[model samples]
Target: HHHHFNLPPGNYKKPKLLYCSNGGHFLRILPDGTVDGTRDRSDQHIQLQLSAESVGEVYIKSTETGQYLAMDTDGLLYGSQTPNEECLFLERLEENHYNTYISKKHAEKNWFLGLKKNGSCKRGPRTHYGQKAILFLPLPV
Candidate 1:
């Protein structure tokens, strides 16, 4: 009962691109296990697969890099080869109609998935529920 979504909660058969409203950037996973927040929506590197583990809980995988989006204990965003507890996220639809992803592994610490204005990582510890940098829109790929 702690989740909300404008988009249905389930596996998306087609890939999606997560576009950040604040920076006009697409979230991407690079081949070298880096997380890029500045990709153009048209870029294939930004394509991601969302597989729901439960309602409002999901795993994000990069279609291009074959890696899962993960957040470390220190609030750093990175790519992991295997999907694990660190990669689980709680997806929520904000009032602005944008989606926000919070690291479920670090939920007690309130770690959110975020990006900076320059299209770089926004460390999770510094993020809050209402920050613009944490808002993302799921675009069709």
Candidate 2:
């Protein structure tokens, strides 16, 4: 016998890494399918901590470019001027969620907000994770 079930509407909120002017930020997808930001001073230069288990994907918001940049988890960086890209040193774990922690110096500069000032992520299926907890210390300018 065949069985069919109906599913509820999928929550569609904007990612926490986009710019409203250009319709959000940009993500850089690596060759391996990992993701990051595409802006000159975004994911390309910041340090990103990931899970302990194997991560096949990574995502970051690129407000300046208004495009998402997804890329492989390999070692990649932007120009030499800005060498603060995100790098994962630990492994990934099952059922583990990833969190981003920016440095106080960076936060004080209001660089994080410049990436995606008004962006947000999903908590549950349709609920947004609010920007309150997203921003690190030092608050944006």
Candidate 3:
């Protein structure tokens, strides 16, 4: 199989897992809809689908939760049952081979994926890059 990590946003790869820096906290959408980082990388891989129409277009979906990573007008990130414009992400490529996605929506857009100091997944602007915002390479175990 081919590794389609960044293939113009369409028909990308599968079985890819999203991890946070350092301890490898896997990005997870809890059953209760709480999105956070978990050290247990053995579960819940997110399959990325390239939107293809443009650059930085894609959907990050949890294999188990049936939800895609979405954002609200308030720069908050959550898991949604249906993908929409809020679900669209402007993929930010990190030089180290990781990625951080910023919201494509307006209305206070420009938020990137990050973790709270307490390790909860949240949306943060460029002000918060570093370890919290950089996602480890989305790859299979």
Candidate 4:
């Protein structure tokens, strides 16, 4: 599977790191389809898979759990099988200067990979100002 790590490619030249905005939690997909924030930021490394249909489209694949981030019709976010549309997401920048992972399947609803109050992953609306929106914090070289 794969994931989109940064902005529209040439928009910027920097390493992209995904951190859930609520309480500044780091997004990670562990094995067994677990999606949550990790206290140890060093272990939440993710990889990207670009889609042929579009240059910016991608899948958020977890290197640790070997799974792709996915959201279901019921708004359930979890690590799923590779290369599926349900697992496809885009890294989009918000006015808050943070990038949110908009699930391709739920773009119309403005659903994003946001974190719950518990620091666990959840799909929430961008219109509602909450901690679910993510950020594109880059790692220092």
Leading candidate by lDDT: 1
Off by over 4 Å in 2: 1-22, 29-103, 113-141
For all predicted structures, in order, the TM-scores are 0.90, 0.20, 0.73, 0.71
Model 4, span 45-118: residue lDDT tens: 44333232355566666655567778888777878866687886666555546666677787777667777556
Candidate whose TM-score is highest: 1
Tens-digit per-residue lDDT, 14-86, candidate 3:
5456667745676667656567777765654344333433655667776676788787766667888887898
**Runs of candidate 3 exceeding 4 Å displacement:** 1-11, 45-53, 106-109, 125-132
C-alpha lDDT of candidate 2 relative to the true structure? 0.26
Model 1 C-alpha lDDT per residue in residues 74-105, reported as the tens digit of each score: 88999999999999998887765778898988
lDDT of 2 by residue, 34-99 (tens): 333343325532232222212322233333332223211222222111112332111111112322
Error of 2 at 14 (Å): 19
Overlapping backbone residue pairs in candidate 3 total 2
